[PDB]
Amino acid sequence: SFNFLIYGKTGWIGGLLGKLCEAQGITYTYGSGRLQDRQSIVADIESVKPSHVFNAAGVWCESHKVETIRTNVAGTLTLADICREKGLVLINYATGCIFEYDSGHPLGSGIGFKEEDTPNFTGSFYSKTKAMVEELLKNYENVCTLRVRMPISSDLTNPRNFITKIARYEKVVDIPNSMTILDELLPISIEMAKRNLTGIYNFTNPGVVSHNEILEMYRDYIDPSFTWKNFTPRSNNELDATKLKTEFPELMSIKESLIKFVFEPNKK
Amino acid sequence: SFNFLIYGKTGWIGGLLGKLCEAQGITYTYGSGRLDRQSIVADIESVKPSHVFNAAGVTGRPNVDWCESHKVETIRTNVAGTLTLADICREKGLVLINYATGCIFEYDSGHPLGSGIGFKEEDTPNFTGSFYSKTKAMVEELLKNYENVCTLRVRMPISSDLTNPRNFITKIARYEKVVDIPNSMTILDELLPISIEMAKRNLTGIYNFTNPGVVSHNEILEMYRDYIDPSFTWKNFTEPRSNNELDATKLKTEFPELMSIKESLIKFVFEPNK
Ligand SMILES: [Cl-]
Ligand SMILES: [Cl-]
Ligand SMILES: [Zn+2]
Ligand SMILES: [Zn+2]
Ligand SMILES: [Zn+2]
Numbered sequence A: 001s002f003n004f005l006i007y008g009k010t011g012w013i014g015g016l017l018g019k020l021c022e023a024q025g026i027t028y029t030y031g032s033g034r035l036q037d038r039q040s041i042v043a044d045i046e047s048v049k050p051s052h053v054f055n056a057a058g059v060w061c062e063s064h065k066v067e068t069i070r071t072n073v074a075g076t077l078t079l080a081d082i083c084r085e086k087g088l089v090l091i092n093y094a095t096g097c098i099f100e101y102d103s104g105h106p107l108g109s110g111i112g113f114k115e116e117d118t119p120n121f122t123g124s125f126y127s128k129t130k131a132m133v134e135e136l137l138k139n140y141e142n143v144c145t146l147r148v149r150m151p152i153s154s155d156l157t158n159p160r161n162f163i164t165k166i167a168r169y170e171k172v173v174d175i176p177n178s179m180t181i182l183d184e185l186l187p188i189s190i191e192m193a194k195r196n197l198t199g200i201y202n203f204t205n206p207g208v209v210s211h212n213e214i215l216e217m218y219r220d221y222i223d224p225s226f227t228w229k230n231f232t233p234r235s236n237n238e239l240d241a242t243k244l245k246t247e248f249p250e251l252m253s254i255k256e257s258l259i260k261f262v263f264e265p266n267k268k
Numbered sequence B: 001s002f003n004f005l006i007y008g009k010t011g012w013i014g015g016l017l018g019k020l021c022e023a024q025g026i027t028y029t030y031g032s033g034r035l036d037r038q039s040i041v042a043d044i045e046s047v048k049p050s051h052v053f054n055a056a057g058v059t060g061r062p063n064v065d066w067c068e069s070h071k072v073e074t075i076r077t078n079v080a081g082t083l084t085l086a087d088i089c090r091e092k093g094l095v096l097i098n099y100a101t102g103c104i105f106e107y108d109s110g111h112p113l114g115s116g117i118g119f120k121e122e123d124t125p126n127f128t129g130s131f132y133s134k135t136k137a138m139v140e141e142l143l144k145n146y147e148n149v150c151t152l153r154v155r156m157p158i159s160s161d162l163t164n165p166r167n168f169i170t171k172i173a174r175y176e177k178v179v180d181i182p183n184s185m186t187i188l189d190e191l192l193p194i195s196i197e198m199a200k201r202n203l204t205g206i207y208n209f210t211n212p213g214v215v216s217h218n219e220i221l222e223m224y225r226d227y228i229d230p231s232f233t234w235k236n237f238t239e240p241r242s243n244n245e246l247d248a249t250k251l252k253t254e255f256p257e258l259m260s261i262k263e264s265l266i267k268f269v270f271e272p273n274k
């Protein structure tokens, strides 16, 4: 009944999805093909005959911008199109870092950006390009787009993990941010496929956390001797968790979720 | 020396291009490939072109309903296909002449109606409420990253062929009332040859690609009347389409012989149709 075609095997979310699909006992296969060409994708689909498809491909000179366009724009739009022609729900792993605190959603307010909102942080190429694709993907009834931010998981060896970035910085800033606890949200995303959810979902845990709060948990739970300094353009914001929370009332707030899925199992 | 790969034989400009290459003795070929990399990659190796022309659409105001199937259809060809084509050309060192739209700008506080102040290449599209408009702006902004691509902003394209329903003149001449707004416009008969020359000169970046100056719908209809049908009649509105002027400085500097709409209209469109 359930059969998953997944793109991005050499990737963080891609790999974790594979391991998730073992322990869940779900049939899955990693897309051999390349997003850059439609021929590949059509083949994979017709060969694998998937019920759902997952896109975890992806996450500035010309060469690297062009490369990103080829995979994040052309490629993502092509997969979306094919999956639509075929009737397949496409889970599209994307970014929430296209918003930033502003006059209508001020730092410290509790008012988060909603799914329906216009991306207000689009100066950087990556940010703009990500906003462009998200806007375009709205016209694809089958696509479900997930706004992931500053992904964190239970494994601190991962240089991509946000906690291990912050515990490395010389000085750090202290700004509350919406973040994605992978261990919790990734099983949730799989459930979203099963329920055939589509549209945009902010895909962070509800509530916000700052670097100081995360470094405090880090010192207490995993290195009691740890020390950091504070400062006496990146994205900072809250995403509104309402829509994702309505569909998934078991979803945990960040601190509470950092404690269970990340810090308690790494205690030392 | 020259060998052109052209996309869009189906369409207005793409058809016109082919005829110009015939008339000028330039070897050209229309691409079989659907804008499917491998399909395009095949064309480039089969044709071994010196330059590539993307007229894959759409010539002018298009043009149907904006439902999902229709929006998606433009995204597949005008976004993913155009970006795929630009990519392959860039990898291969090939210059790509991309025919596109100027109808992504609108009269504003800093470029007011009647001011003679026109939008520049560098300017940020300010008319992007509608899907088509936002989408073409997106692609245009993205194409800025492909140094081999030459984006041309064509507005309300016009031909000496007054029988062609795509021609802006015959649209307006066939309508009951009309809006009368000064606009920048493109005389294909004059401007299409120039685009062949831009390719020859390996030009790149964005060019506003309308004739210098503006005409209103009325100034045009009056010329229709005195040149083709003196018995012609029309009323106005007393009561959203893109209305703007496009700065022609950059195109004129590169092409001094470029004429303004009115004189270009007279010479290319109306006089050889008396
Ligand atoms: Cl708002
Ligand atoms: Cl400006
Ligand atoms: Zn680089
Ligand atoms: Zn980020
Ligand atoms: Zn809001």
Ligand SMILES: [Zn+2]
Pocket: B060, B061, B103, B155, B156, B157
């Ligand atoms: Zn137009």
Ligand SMILES: [Zn+2]
Pocket: B111, B118, B119, B120, B123
């Ligand atoms: Zn200006």
Ligand SMILES: [Zn+2]
Pocket: A062, B147
């Ligand atoms: Zn280069």
